[PDB]
């Protein structure tokens, strides 16, 4: 009832322009600051069936976005109120990765592809060193500003991790989900986002996701048809999994990682990094630090700034 609120300006300070979010991904607006014209993005904190006051997940997202301040992570300007409802104020990045990939008018050179994956791996390295899992790595969550700066976005399903954990297994989209989550691992960590990073790297040349599963069994079958069957010789101690005896999957598959992706990817170093990103074993999957030191980012052509 007309309360004193210095540190929470009203969302009317921005002027809405157009909707950029429909349906599942809430209602997002492109907005313009009424004085400086700074282009921003507003997301109303949805209060659907919240019988517990302010959403605990909105608290978790806000807390995460306040800790993560990086050139390759979206920036939370502030949180605004209304004339109670709550909005999230982000800096506006015009382009997304999925929108550029599914547009035939857009073309990436090998040098620009090196820059995109370097900014994504640098962003994943920063959030992993800050004890933050993204748990929603996909092309639609990767945005690029009009300056060519890649930003990691959509930290809603993101959670913190520490070092027997009991985490949430129903995370990450089916097409980008690592084999650990499909097998029902509740003690997972950073490499679950690095698996989705490999599915994005290959998507740069294929312009379409590589493992478009329909069910959880169809996704685990699609993984084995490309990265080889789930073998205890390939995945040491994959035995303890509950669904390992109940998988019902292919058993004689051999890694089609470099063979099936050979047509779209021309570079030898790029295929070698994708192979190490899409590794079945999490303990043997390449991490954010080693992948940035991989010879893919250190051979000709070198990474170049983004323009097309």
């Amino acid at each position: 009832d007309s309360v004193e609120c210095p540190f929470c300006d009203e969302v009317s300070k921005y002027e809405k322009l157009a909707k950029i979010g429909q349906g599942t991904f809430g209602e997002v607006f492109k907005a313009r600051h009424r004085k400086t014209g700074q282009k921003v993005a507003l997301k109303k904190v949805l209060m659907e069936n919240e019988k517990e006051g302010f959403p605990i997940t909105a608290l978790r997202e806000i807390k995460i976005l306040q800790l993560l301040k990086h050139e390759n992570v979206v920036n939370l300007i502030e949180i605004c109120r209304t004339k109670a409802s709550i909005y999230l104020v982000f800096d506006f990045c015009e382009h997304d990765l999925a929108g550029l990939l599914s547009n035939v008018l857009v073309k990436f050179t090998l040098s620009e592809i090196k820059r995109v994956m370097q900014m994504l791996l640098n962003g994943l390295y920063y959030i992993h060193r800050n004890k933050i899992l993204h748990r929603d790595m996909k092309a639609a969550n990767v945005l690029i500003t009009r300056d060519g700066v890649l930003k990691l976005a959509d930290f809603g399903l993101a959670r913190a991790f520490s070092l027997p954990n009991r985490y949430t297994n129903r995370v990450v989209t089916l097409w980008y989900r690592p084999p650990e989550l499909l097998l029902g691992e509740r003690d997972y960590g950073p490499p679950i986002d690095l698996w989705g990073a490999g599915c994005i790297m290959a998507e740069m040349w294929t312009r379409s996701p590589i493992m478009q599963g329909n069910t959880e069994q169809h996704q685990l079958a699609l993984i084995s048809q490309l990265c080889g069957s789930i073998t205890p010789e390939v995945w040491p101690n994959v035995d303890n999994y509950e669904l390992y005896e109940k998988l019902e999957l292919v058993k004689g598959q051999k890694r089609k990682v470099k063979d099936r992706l050979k047509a779209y990817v021309r570079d030898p170093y790029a295929l070698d990094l994708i192979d190490k990103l899409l590794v079945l074993d999490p303990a043997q999957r390449i991490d954010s630090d080693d992948a940035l030191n991989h010879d893919f980012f250190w051979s000709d052509p070198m990474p170049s700034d983004l323009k097309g």
Binding site: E4, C8, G53, I56, Q66, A84
Partner: protein, 252 residues
């Protein structure tokens, strides 16, 4: 700014409660009452000491913007504890917080019917009050507590289990009895908590080989002129609190 939620002695004097008639001593009594209600409810709701301390720091900052006259301590604390519980990984159910907050404030009254008109209002009132707390704090919910810096400092002075527990005791009660959390950083308050705990237990950490005191290794801005000044303020109000010093007094 890093100077947003930190105030001067003149700033605290001109608090919003001062502008509605609350005396300087009357306001400290209001803060001490709320922390006891936050600790009482937190001990009943079975939340960690970290959760309670976060709700207390919310309350201390909440009344730097709002006044105790417009927002009573008996109303803000159950909403501040409900918020801090959800943030600190120990979420308590909304109908449970009001259940405990009732018998804490009204031990003789009976809780109204869950489908009554009055009960549905206070359920709305707590959610309304939680929303106002979030708006008052600017959604700045991450709190650094001196307990993180106390353990890191008693380990490097080789203090026993007893002295480390006393330093932990000085930290929990500095949030209950003083506005140190509104003026001095957690590393500075932790130095004040260990200094008074050493003065209490006749423990004296000698100077290191570099001629450097132990508090220089924790925060460079800490001086002995400041430590004795703050341990004196903390000790006075500790001497005013009943049965508080008995918990750390040596009967042997």
């Amino acid at each position: 700014n890093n100077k947003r939620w930190y105030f001067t002695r003149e700033q605290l004097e001109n608090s919003p409660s001062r502008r509605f008639g609350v005396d300087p001593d009357k306001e400290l009594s209001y803060r001490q009452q709320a922390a006891n209600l936050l600790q009482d409810m937190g001990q009943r709701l079975n939340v960690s000491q970290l959760t309670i301390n976060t709700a207390i720091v919310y309350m201390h900052r909440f009344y730097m913007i709002q006044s105790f006259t417009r927002f009573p301590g008996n109303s803000v604390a159950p909403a501040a504890l409900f918020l801090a519980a959800k943030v600190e990984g120990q979420p308590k159910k909304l109908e449970h917080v009001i259940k405990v907050a009732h018998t804490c404030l009204h031990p003789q009254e009976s809780l109204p019917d869950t489908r009554s008109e009055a009960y549905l209002q206070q359920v709305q009132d707590l959610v309304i009050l939680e929303s106002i707390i979030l708006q008052t704090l600017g959604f700045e919910l991450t709190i650094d507590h001196p307990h993180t810096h106390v353990v890191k400092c008693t380990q490097l002075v080789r203090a026993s289990k007893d002295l480390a527990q006393t330093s932990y005791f000085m930290a929990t009660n500095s949030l209950h009895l003083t506005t140190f959390s509104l003026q001095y950083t957690p590393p500075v308050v932790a130095c004040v908590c260990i200094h008074l705990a050493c003065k209490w237990s006749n423990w004296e950490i000698p100077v290191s080989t570099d001629g450097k005191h132990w508090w220089e290794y924790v925060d460079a801005t800490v001086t002995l002129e400041l430590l004795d000044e703050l341990t004196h303020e903390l000790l006075q109000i500790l001497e005013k609190t009943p049965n508080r010093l008995k918990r750390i007094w040596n009967w042997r």
